[PDB]
Every structure is written in structure tokens, then in C-alpha cells.
Amino acid sequence: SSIRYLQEIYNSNNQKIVNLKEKVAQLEAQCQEPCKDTVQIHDITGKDCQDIANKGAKQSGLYFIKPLKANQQFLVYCEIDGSGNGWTVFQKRLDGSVDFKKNWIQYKEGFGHLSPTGTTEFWLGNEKIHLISTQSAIPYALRVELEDWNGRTSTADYAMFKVGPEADKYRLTYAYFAGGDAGDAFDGFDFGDDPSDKFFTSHNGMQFSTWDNDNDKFEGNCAEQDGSGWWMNKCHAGHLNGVYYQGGTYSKASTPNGYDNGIIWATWKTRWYSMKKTTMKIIPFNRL
């Protein structure tokens, strides 16, 4: 039988608990906020990316715009350069991460993702392109920029670019080719012996086609065959919404239907060479 209480261990524990509860309350206040999202949308807004640049925005990234005739505002990627030019980007290819075999509604409404860094693939949506490019008495321009698999880039410019309403199947129109070292694939290409191939591969005045909404000049279905949505003729010489091929080079054996269905621009590279990157972007013509 021994007589030792000690018991300071008990009281020292109670005090250690009361102090621990203080530490626990302090940790709670540090775990209230969510994960920080690197993706933010800018505050400045306007009719388009040029209007936004005119209001003093200097950074390329994500912005809401609302053309006058638009019922609601919508998000876009704006490219803003050191000279106050604000490009509205409506198409981007970069790495093959997004499937471009999409239907009429999907091409109408848009698909893919928008990033502040401009490092994502997307189609903005035909309805939006139509709204931006048909603002009352504001001539627009389109720039197509292409990158090959060896880091070379080229461009093609089209003056008075317009995309028509859904009632005219989002018809592509422009007044003239305004130059650029990629050449004018929208004028079609003289591929071979057939005297009508250049006429049937041009894109000016072509209605938009998807697999489920065929508005091309072919007995068959260009968009279904080539797995895309595009302003098809019979069928194409520039085809930026085509299948992404790693390394550029592909062949008839690469495809289910036997046709050139890659990301092509026939005036710059053979139709069996598929671009590493493409950008389709629009700006008021007077900025050029």
C-alpha cells in the first residue's frame, strides 16, 4: 500500500486541453475559404474586344461582351496587343484535347473551354460570331493564324467578314482576301486535273454544315465524312475544325472514309498535313 497522489498530471492535462481548444479554434478560422481559382474574369465589358480595349483594358484574357442586338452577354477570350487592338477569338486549336465532331446545336452555341492564358481549344458558337460580326455598320475583319509542327507561323486576312443568321445557316461571307503568307485557302485550291476543283473547294458564301444539318454543295455529307462542322462546299480547301493529327503528317489510311479530314489550309501545306495550332479571330476592319 503506497500513498502518492501526484495528480498534477490530471490538472496539467485539463489546462493543456483548454489551450489545445484555443489552437483548434484558430485552425478553424484558417479553413473557411475555398481553393483559390487561378481563372478570373475581368470587370470591363463592351460590345466586343475592341470596345473593351478602347475602354483601357490592356490584358489578354476572359471578358464578357454584349453586342447591341445580343439578348444576353457572353464570355469571350480577348487578345489585346501593345497597340490597343482588341481581337475577339472565336476558334482555337492547340493540342487535340477537344472533340470537334459536334452537332448543329453545339456549333451554334459553342463548345470547348475558355482560359485567361489562351491555352485551351474552343469554338465560340455560330450565333455569337454572327452577333459580333453583324453589329450595325461596323465592317469586320477575320485573321486566321496557323502554326506548323516546326514552329513556323503564317496568317491569312479576310476583309468585311460576316457570319449570317441561323435562318441563312450561318453563311460565311467576306468582300476580299486582304493578304498574308498562309495564302487564300477560302478561294479554293487547284488540287488536280478536274477543272472544277478550285470552284468546289472555295468557302466564300458557303452555308455552315454539321453531320445533322447538311447545307453543302455535295450530293453526300461533307461534314459527316470529314468529322467536323464547317462552311463546306464540295468539300474544302481550308478546314480548321478538322481532326487533330499529332506530328502533322497523316494519310488516306489514317481516316475511316478515305478523305483529307485534318486541320488543313491547302495554300500553305499539302492537305495531308495537319496544323499544330490555329486561331480564328475578329476585329473591326479599321484597326488594320
Binding site: 473547294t201 461533307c222 464540295k234 468539300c235
Partner: peptide, 4 residues
């Protein structure tokens, strides 16, 4: 491309 073209469709012959």
C-alpha cells in the same frame, strides 16, 4: 479536298 474536292469530291470528283
Amino acid at each position: 479536298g474536292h469530291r470528283p
